[PDB]
Symmetry: none
Subunit: 68 residues, 6 copies
């Protein structure tokens, strides 16, 4: 079997300026009041007003390759 794929591709971006960005995620109020819960198997729990992810990359380009 011959497996010889060729990749000469390019991912490119030009940004003259990136900025004057104001990000103000709002919190909010959270309340949790459990009483008589029973767990017969494993548990994962998250509690919180704000979960925030912010990306401001100058590039931020993504290339994914997979061969099998």
């Amino acid at each position: 079997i011959v497996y010889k794929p060729v990749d000469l591709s390019k991912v490119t971006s030009k940004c003259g300026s990136l900025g004057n960005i104001h990000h103000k995620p709002g919190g909010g109020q959270v309340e949790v009041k459990s009483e008589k819960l029973d767990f017969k198997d494993r548990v994962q729990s998250k509690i919180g007003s704000l979960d925030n992810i912010t990306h401001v990359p100058g590039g931020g380009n993504k290339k994914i390759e997979t061969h099998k």
Copy 2:
């Protein structure tokens, strides 16, 4: 079997200026009351007003490659 893929590819970015970025995530108020719980197998817990991730890379480009 001959496995000989070729990769001459590129991921590239030009950013003339990255900046003037204001990021101000707000907290918020959290309460958790739990009383009479029972767990027969393992537990993971997170509690907290804010969980925050911020990326401001000058590049931030990603190339992911996998061969099997």
Copy 3:
């Protein structure tokens, strides 16, 4: 079997300036009242107003390869 993949690829970024970034995550108020909890196996717990991660690299580029 012959395994000889060829990789001459590149990940690159040009950033003229990186800066004037103001990051101010707000705390928030957190409360946790447990009373009669019972755990028959291991527990992992995190409690806290703010969990914060911040990255401001001049590059921040990633190239990942896996071969099997």
Copy 4:
């Protein structure tokens, strides 16, 4: 002129118990940007996340009298 008003009145309270009070005023995030303001007359200014007044008196009764 005769001024002889008579006051025999009473203000009274009975409290069997006062307590098990949980008061948790939330803060919040505040920002003030002023730029080119001009004040030709006097100024009073207050800036702050929380201004809180709390009264838990065992009595707390008030009587006000004025004669002219």
Copy 5:
């Protein structure tokens, strides 16, 4: 002119117990950027996350009287 007002009044309270009070005012985050302000007359300014007043008197009763 005859001025002879008579005051035999009473302000009273009975409290069996005062207590088990939890007061936890949250701070909060405050920011003030001024740039080119001009004041031609006097200025009063207060800046601060928390301003708090708390009264837990066993009595706390008030009587105010004025004659003119």
Copy 6:
């Protein structure tokens, strides 16, 4: 003119117990940037995370009188 007001009034309190009071004012974070401010008359300024006043008197009663 005859001025002879009569005051035999009373302010009183009975408190069986005063206590088990937990007061925890939170600080908070404060920032103040001024740049080119101009003041032509006097200035009063206060800057600080927490300003706190707490009163827990067994009595705390007040009687105020004014005559003119």
